[PDB]
Paper text:
Asparaginases (EC 3.5.1.1), which split L-asparagine to L-aspartate and ammonia, are grouped into three unrelated structural classes: Class 1 (bacterial-type), Class 2 (plant-type), and Class 3 (Rhizobium etli-type). ReAV is a homodimer with an α/β protomeric fold, formed by two tightly packed domains. The active site of the enzyme is located in a cleft on the protomer surface and marked by a zinc ion with an unusual coordination sphere created by Cys135, Lys138, Cys189, and a water molecule. The conspicuous catalytic center of the enzyme comprises two Ser-Lys tandems (Ser48-Lys51 and Ser80-Lys263), centered around the curiously hydrated Ser48 residue and located in the close vicinity of the metal binding site.
The ReAV D187A crystal structure revealed that the absence of Asp187 induced only small local conformational changes and atomic shifts, and these changes are strictly equivalent in the two dimers. The zinc cation is only partially present at the metal binding site, with a refined occupancy of 0.5, as is the w1 water molecule from the metal coordination sphere. Moreover, substitution of Asp187 with alanine affected the metal environment, since a sulfate ion occurs right next to the strongly bound water molecule from the zinc coordination sphere. The sulfate ion fills a central position in the active site cleft, possibly preventing the enzyme from accepting a substrate molecule. The negatively charged SO4 2- anion forms a salt bridge with the protonated and positively charged side chain of Arg47. The hydration pattern of Ser48 is nearly identical as in the WT protein, with three closely-spaced water molecules in the vicinity of the Ser48 hydroxyl group. Surprisingly, the side chain of Cys249 is not oxidized to sulfenic acid, which may be related to a change in the zinc environment. Although Ser48 remained hydrated in the D187A mutant, the mutation completely abolished the enzymatic activity, despite the fact that this mutein can still bind zinc (KD of 7.2 μM). This observation may be correlated with the presence of the sulfate ion in the active site, which would hinder the acceptance of a genuine substrate molecule. We hypothesize that with altered metal binding properties, the coordination site of the D187A mutant could become specific for other transition metal ions, which could be bound during protein bacterial expression or purification on Ni2+ resin.
Author numbering:
A (entry chain B), B (entry chain A): 4 to 352
The structure:
């Protein structure tokens, strides 16, 4: 397949970007694809709901009283807005830990507007400012809850990371050896697996949400997955922030799906069963995963929004809240439009 | 044909980027290649030496007394450092123009350190700060020199832009219809032509420098090309700025070559004849042009530096000054090395 997103200047090709995507049902069966839907792919932050599941399944973590917004922050790549930093500090208090216990580092904010404020202030970001700070507090919580020590909670030999590694493989329905591990920007183990299994994780999230809402008896795992979905959809501003794709996406859809960014341009969406999912040929929930081969985020958001339109997910009115991402502005320094974005890719069934 | 630069996280593929490259002799004969060496490509700022030639060949421009550093700024994508703004203003004064005559617009600086200083002072960049401001003053100069009027100097129907279009096609050895035109970020016509012809332009620059140095009877155009080469090599800080690839590259090579960035990740180099170029099998100067298909600038500089090493251009000590670009750091927020860059491409003859 030769599936691309392409930018032009006056009709002349500027850049082209290879697209990979998987659309799967709740059991992970492949329904539609772009590119190579089984591309071995670092999920990066798109794995965070699976890491939050490992946190929430750690015995004793329930006693700390994390609320839904705290869980959404565990699932976040937040913009380090003051509310994200404050909630991180409030979560540290719940587990009687301190910022010095964190093993993630500060970085320039993922939001340009926040980062400009920091620059004006000469603000130096610290550990609680990390976009991953919520995940790290949850990992510290789990380490405290099982009692072997918080030192080294971020290292592969720690039981919290053994729990994460098993949980990821289980949600993917993969043997341990089919998940590879590197080290994240936030200094935790981070997984790679075929792209379609990232879709599978998010189909399982949305499916658990459907079962919870229907009143079905659920395993402890499915109940926790439903809780994670509900937390992300109820507090999408915790998952990213003002003006961010994931937040704007989840607000527009008002509970019908959850979406999550991975660094270097992966994206995952879990869609609750609907007229649209039935029209796509499945009787339950759906999962979507996307990777832009070269890592370009602006192209990722254009492609994800185009894919939602092609799949019929939402309505023109709902998806129109994402118009600035769908068709990125190509306006020069004098206000003249110089080109645009095109989608020469073809979904295959 | 399948030529990539690949980044990894712990040996796991993160992103990959398709590379196109042409290495040509002084007549444009293809000597080595990556990818598609004739890819139709927007040269963007890498066309600036051709545009400077059109300016310098305009009747009467010699009377303004532009010096080598002014010509270097005509060829620049500068960082908007105070010295670039000051030289822009001095060039405007040479032609008795003012900032309001410029038809380029301000933008965030190409240098992070300049841009952070601006953010701290709440500085809003204006036309005089454009990375293309030196080209624009040169175009105003040519318009005024032939009595065409400054108004509209940037529009395709203006005789200055007629001269630019002719000069570009002639340097490429192309018919007019083989060069396509869009509108630049700086609001001028900007050309697209086969990537190898960008290398041809720069081989002609270095060839002319060789012929000037050898005291050959040069055409006036060759003499002006030699002047442009000399100006860029003598004043590389004008062409980009502190810490910028083009500046560090040209300083390391100390007159042996010139190099120039194009936006969306094109690069061009003109190499004077040397033991290295003779070892590559040509008896004259050579040109190099590169495009990263997806537009990533970090990967461009890594690839260009790797190509100089494969081609044997420079000494190991000279190219070690570019080590930070050749293998970009992949260290996380806690100081842990998480990945690297690889060059599985192979130069073909
Ligand atoms: Cl990293
Ligand atoms: Cl533009
Ligand atoms: Zn992280
Ligand atoms: Zn320009």
């Amino acid at each position: 397949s030769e599936d691309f997103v392409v930018t032009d200047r006056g009709g002349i090709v500027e850049n082209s970007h290879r697209v990979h995507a998987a659309v799967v049902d709740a059991k992970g069966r492949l329904l539609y694809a772009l590119g190579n839907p089984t591309r071995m792919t670092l999920a990066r932050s798109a794995a965070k709901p699976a890491q939050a599941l490992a946190i929430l399944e750690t015995e004793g973590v329930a006693g700390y009283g994390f609320d839904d917004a705290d869980i959404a922050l565990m699932c976040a790549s937040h913009s380090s807005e003051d509310r994200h930093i404050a909630r991180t500090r409030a979560m540290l208090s719940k587990i009687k830990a301190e910022e010095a216990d964190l093993r993630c580092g500060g970085h320039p904010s993922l939001s340009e507007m926040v980062n400009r404020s920091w620059i004006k202030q000469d603000f130096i970001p610290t550990a609680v400012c990390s976009n991953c700070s919520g995940k790290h507090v949850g990992m510290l919580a789990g380490a405290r809850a099982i009692g072997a020590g918080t030192d080294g909670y971020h290292l592969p030999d720690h039981p919290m990371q053994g729990r994460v590694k098993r949980t990821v493989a289980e949600l993917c329905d993969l043997d341990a050896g089919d998940v590879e591990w590197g080290t994240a920007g936030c200094n935790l183990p981070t997984p790679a697996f075929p792209l379609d299994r990232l879709g599978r994780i998010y189909a399982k999230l949305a499916s658990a949400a459907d079962g919870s809402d229907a009143g079905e008896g659920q395993s402890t795992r499915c109940a926790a997955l439903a809780h994670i979905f509900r937390a992300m959809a109820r507090h999408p501003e915790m998952v990213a922030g003002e003006g961010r794709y994931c937040t704007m996406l989840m607000r527009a859809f008002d509970g019908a799906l959850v979406g999550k960014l991975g660094a270097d341009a992966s994206y995952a969406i879990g869609v609750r069963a609907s007229d649209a999912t039935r029209q796509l040929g499945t009787d339950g929930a759906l999962g979507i995963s996307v990777k832009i081969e070269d890592g370009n985020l602006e192209m990722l958001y254009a492609v994800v929004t185009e894919l939602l339109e092609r799949l019929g997910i939402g309505s023109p009115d709902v998806r129109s809240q994402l118009a600035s991402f769908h068709h990125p502005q190509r306006v020069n320094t004098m206000g003249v439009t110089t080109g645009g974005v095109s989608f020469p890719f073809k979904l295959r069934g």
